[PDB]
Design a protein around this nucleic acid. Structure first.
Lengths: 46, 98, 88
RNA sequence: AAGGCGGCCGAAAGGCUAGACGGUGGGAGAGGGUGGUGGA
RNA sequence: ACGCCGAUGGCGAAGGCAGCCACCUGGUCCACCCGUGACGCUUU
C-alpha cells in the first residue's frame, strides 16, 4: 500500500529516490506518504 | 460525518497512570467533538528518525473515527494543548493504494 | 459542501413532473442554491477573488436561463421568478 | 449594459437532438481562500 | 529558502500557483444516457 504512511519497513526502501521502479502515478503518491511519515518523525528528512 | 485517521505521538517517559490519563483525555476530546471511534491502534514506543522533544523515541497512537468535517480542526487544536502531546496529525481516511 | 440529499430537496420542489431533473426551472433553482451558498462563503473570505469570479459567472448563467424561459415560455418564467423570490 | 456568429427539419411559427446546461456515478490537479503545524 | 520527489508533469482567465494537515470554495475531465430542449459562442 503506497498510502500507508507508517510502514517504515517498506517506505525505508525508497529513501526521495527518483523514478525506485515506481511509475509516474505511483511516485508522488509515494512521496506524500513519505512526507507524512517524516513529520511523524517515522522517516528522516536528512 | 467523515472518516479520518488521528495519529498521535505522546511523550514516551510517562507512567501507567499519566499515560492512562492522557488517553482518557484524548477520548473525551474525540467524544466531545462528535467523533465515534471505529478502531484504535497503539504501537507505542518507536525508535523515531530525528529528535522530537529531545527524546529519540515516542509513543505512537492512532484511532480511526467518524466525525463532522467541520470539527476536525477544532479537535486537533484540542489534542495539541497537552504538554505530553508533541505531535498530532489528522488525515482524511483513504482506501489503500495497491 | 452541498449534499445530494439537500439537492434533491430542491429538485422535487421545482420539478415540472416526477423525474424532471434538468428543466430550466430546476436548473435555475439549483444554481440559486449554489449562488446562495457561494455568496455566504464569500461573505467571509473577501480575498478569494478566483472563486468570486465563479460567482459572477454563475449569476450570469442564471440570467441567461431566465431570459430564455421568459422568452420561450412566459408562462413558466411567471411562477419561477416568483417561487424563487428572485428578481425584484 | 449596445453588436455580430450559431447544428437538423420548417416559408414561418415552431419542432429536434448531436451543442449547452442539469441529474447520477467516477477521475486528476502547486486553481483560490481560512485555520494550523513541520523543517531548513 | 520551504530540499529530495519535480518531469519533454499539473492547475488557472490573465498575473501566476510547490513542505504537510484540515476546512471553505471556483474551474475541468470520462461514463450513462436519465432530464430541459439550441438555453450556445463572442466583440467593445
Amino acid at each position: 500500500d503506497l498510502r500507508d504512511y507508517r510502514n517504515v519497513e517498506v517506505l525505508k526502501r525508497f529513501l526521495i529516490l527518483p523514478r525506485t521502479g515506481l511509475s509516474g502515478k505511483e511516485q508522488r503518491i509515494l512521496a506524500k506518504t513519505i512526507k507524512r511519515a517524516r513529520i511523524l518523525g517515522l522517516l528522516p528528512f536528512t | 460525518m467523515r472518516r479520518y485517521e488521528v495519529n498521535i505521538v505522546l511523550n514516551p517517559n510517562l507512567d501507567q497512570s499519566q499515560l492512562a490519563l492522557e488517553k482518557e483525555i484524548i477520548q473525551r476530546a474525540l467524544e466531545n467533538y462528535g467523533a465515534r471511534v471505529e478502531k484504535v491502534e497503539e504501537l507505542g514506543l518507536r525508535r523515531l528518525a530525528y529528535p522530537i522533544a529531545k527524546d529519540p523515541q515516542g509513543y505512537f497512537l492512532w484511532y480511526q473515527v467518524e466525525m463532522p468535517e467541520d470539527r476536525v480542526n477544532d479537535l486537533a487544536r484540542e489534542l495539541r494543548i497537552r504538554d505530553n502531546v508533541r505531535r498530532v496529525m489528522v488525515v482524511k481516511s483513504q482506501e489503500p493504494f495497491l | 459542501p452541498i449534499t445530494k440529499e439537500e439537492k434533491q430537496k430542491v429538485i422535487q420542489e421545482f420539478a415540472r413532473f416526477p423525474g424532471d431533473t434538468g428543466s430550466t426551472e430546476v436548473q435555475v433553482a439549483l444554481l440559486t442554491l449554489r449562488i446562495n451558498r457561494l455568496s455566504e462563503h464569500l461573505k467571509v473570505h473577501k480575498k478569494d477573488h478566483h472563486s468570486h469570479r465563479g460567482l459572477l459567472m454563475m449569476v450570469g448563467q442564471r440570467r441567461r436561463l431566465l431570459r430564455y424561459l421568459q422568452r420561450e415560455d412566459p408562462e413558466r418564467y411567471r411562477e419561477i421568478v416568483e417561487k424563487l423570490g428572485l428578481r425584484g
